[PDB]
Amino acid sequence: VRERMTTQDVEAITPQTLINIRPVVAAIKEFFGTSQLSQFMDQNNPLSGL
Amino acid sequence: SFSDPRFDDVKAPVDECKDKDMTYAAPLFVTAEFINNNTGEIKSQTVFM
Amino acid sequence: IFKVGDTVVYPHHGAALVEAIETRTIKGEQKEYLVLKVAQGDLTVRVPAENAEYVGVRDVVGQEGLDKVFQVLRAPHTEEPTNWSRRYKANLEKLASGDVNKVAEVVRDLWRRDQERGLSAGEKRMLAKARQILVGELALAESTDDAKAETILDEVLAA
Numbered sequence: 001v002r003e004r005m006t007t008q009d010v011e012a013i014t015p016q017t018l019i020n021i022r023p024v025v026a027a028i029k030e031f032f033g034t035s036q037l038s039q040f041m042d043q044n045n046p047l048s049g050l
Numbered sequence: 051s052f053s054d055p056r057f058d059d060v061k062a063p064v065d066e067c068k069d070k071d072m073t074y075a076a077p078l079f080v081t082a083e084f085i086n087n088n089t090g091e092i093k094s095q096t097v098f099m
Numbered sequence: 100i101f102k103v104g105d106t107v108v109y110p111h112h113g114a115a116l117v118e119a120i121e122t123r124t125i126k127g128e129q130k131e132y133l134v135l136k137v138a139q140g141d142l143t144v145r146v147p148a149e150n151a152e153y154v155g156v157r158d159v160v161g162q163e164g165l166d167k168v169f170q171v172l173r174a175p176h177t178e179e180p181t182n183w184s185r186r187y188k189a190n191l192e193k194l195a196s197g198d199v200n201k202v203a204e205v206v207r208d209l210w211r212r213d214q215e216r217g218l219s220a221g222e223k224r225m226l227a228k229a230r231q232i233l234v235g236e237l238a239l240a241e242s243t244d245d246a247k248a249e250t251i252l253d254e255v256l257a258a
């Protein structure tokens with residue numbers, strides 16, 4: 001955002017033209033999949049779920 | 051700026067997501083706002099995050 | 100100048116509508132902060148009328164500019180050499196300039212071009228985008244429909 005802020009011309013931009021949410025959703029999906037802390041719910045019985 | 055993250059409903063129910071291998075998601079809506087110090091305007095979009 | 104409920108063309112975003120003229124506070128004073136929503140970007144733009152002339156906001160030009168660009172087309176014979184990167188830079192700077200007549204002349208040049216030659220992919224992207232904003236300005240210049248303005252194009256474009 002700060003990078004393209006200077007490269008973009010005035011009176012022609014909008015937050016839709018400024019913001020890339022692709023790295024944000026990539027960070028969310030990169031945490032929920034393929035982390036250490038995200039885990040398959042070990043659920044052979046409800047006590048192991050709990 | 052950035053202001054007021056809010057949500058929509060879920061995209062799909064629980065077992066439907068579990069069957070179709072979709073993540074049980076919900077959209078993020080954010081009242082984003084851009085302001086120029088040069089002349090001064092608000093640019094109050096609603097960015098889907 | 101501007102009253103609530105009037106259509107008004109705001110560059111580069113084009114035509115938009117005023118919702119109110121708020122006098123909100125900064126530095127003690129309260130100025131002509133007109134809140135204005137647009138149709139494309141779906142955002143509300145607080146504009147002060149003290150620098151509406153700075154940003155160059157525009158009441159919608161009608162049949163004067165319409166017949167102006169309609170006088171320009173159907174023999175829009177321009178010379179530009181095969182320096183087509185220079186051509187694209189020139190019309191991109193023109194497109195940033197946001198003049199209705201020049202933008203219309205260049206997209207009718209692009210119509211004349213792809214009628215024979217065929218534009219590039221991003222060239223056609225720029226073509227369709229400028230057709231979109233120019234047609235929105237036209238369809239609120241006559242205060243009418245998008246399909247009406249497109250039929251207007253088809254019946255004037257070398258016609």
Ligand SMILES: C/C(=C\[C@H](C)CCCCC(=O)O)[C@@H]1O[C@@H]2C=C[C@@H]1OC(=O)\C=C/C=C\C=C\[C@H]1O[C@@H]3C[C@H]1O[C@@H](/C=C/C[C@H]1O[C@H](C[C@H](O)[C@H]1C)[C@@H](O)[C@@H](O)/C=C/CC/C=C/C2)[C@@H]3C
Nearest residue numbers: 033034035036037038039040041042043044047048049050
């Ligand atoms: C060593 C380790 C996990 C091992 C695979 C199992 C943990 C020890 C289980 C035990 O002996 O009691 C650590 O796991 C992570 C962080 C560091 C380590 O990463 C590590 O070094 C190893 C893996 C880190 C992330 C793995 C992600 C994915 O790999 C698969 C899918 C995703 O997560 C894994 C899920 C494992 C659940 C386990 O659950 C255990 C039983 C089984 O061993 C497993 C079913 C249950 O005892 C449960 O109560 C205990 C859960 C562990 C608590 C939090 C662990 C986070 C599954 C194997």
